Each structure stands twice: as structure tokens, then as C-alpha cells.
Design a protein around this ligand. Structure first.
Ligand SMILES: [Mg+2]
Ligand code: NI
Length: 80
């Protein structure tokens, strides 16, 4: 198949960061509203991970880097 396909950024639950911090980071880095950021934070915390953004591989690479700088456990993968 082709490599021009969409990717996602995933945040993984970590035992150190405050829930309030994670909500704030999603608002700050992605411009998300409070209800949206809180829902994603709670999904990370209750499911162990959440897709937080989606787009091209190169765009997701930026989101991962931004999240790492904020101290969050982020990875990216191709979306199937
Ligand atoms: Mg994390
Ligand atoms: Ni998917």
C-alpha cells in the first residue's frame, strides 16, 4: 500500500502529571476547548491512552514534539 496515509498522536497515561495539567496542556498546545480537553484527559486516565490529534505524519511529528516538551508521554502511529 501507499505511505501517504493519515496518522494519529496518542497520549499515554503516566503516574506523575496532574490531571489538571494534562487538561491545560491540551488546551494550550491544540487550542481545544475545556470540555474537549477534559474529555481527552479523562480518556487517557481511564483507558490508558487516547488519540489527541490526527493528520499527516509530519504534522503528528510536531504534535509529539510539543507534547514531549510539556512532559507528556506521546507517540504517533499510522491510522488504519
Ligand atoms: Mg502522559
Ligand atoms: Ni483509528
Amino acid at each position: 500500500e501507499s505511505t501517504e496515509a493519515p496518522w494519529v498522536t496518542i497520549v499515554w497515561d503516566d503516574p506523575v502529571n496532574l490531571m489538571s495539567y494534562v487538561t491545560y496542556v491540551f488546551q494550550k498546545l491544540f487550542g481545544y476547548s475545556e470540555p474537549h480537553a477534559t474529555k481527552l484527559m479523562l480518556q487517557v486516565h481511564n483507558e490508558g491512552k487516547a488519540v489527541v490529534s490526527a493528520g499527516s505524519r509530519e504534522s503528528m511529528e510536531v504534535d509529539v514534539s510539543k507534547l514531549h516538551a510539556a512532559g507528556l508521554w506521546a507517540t504517533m502511529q499510522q491510522d488504519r
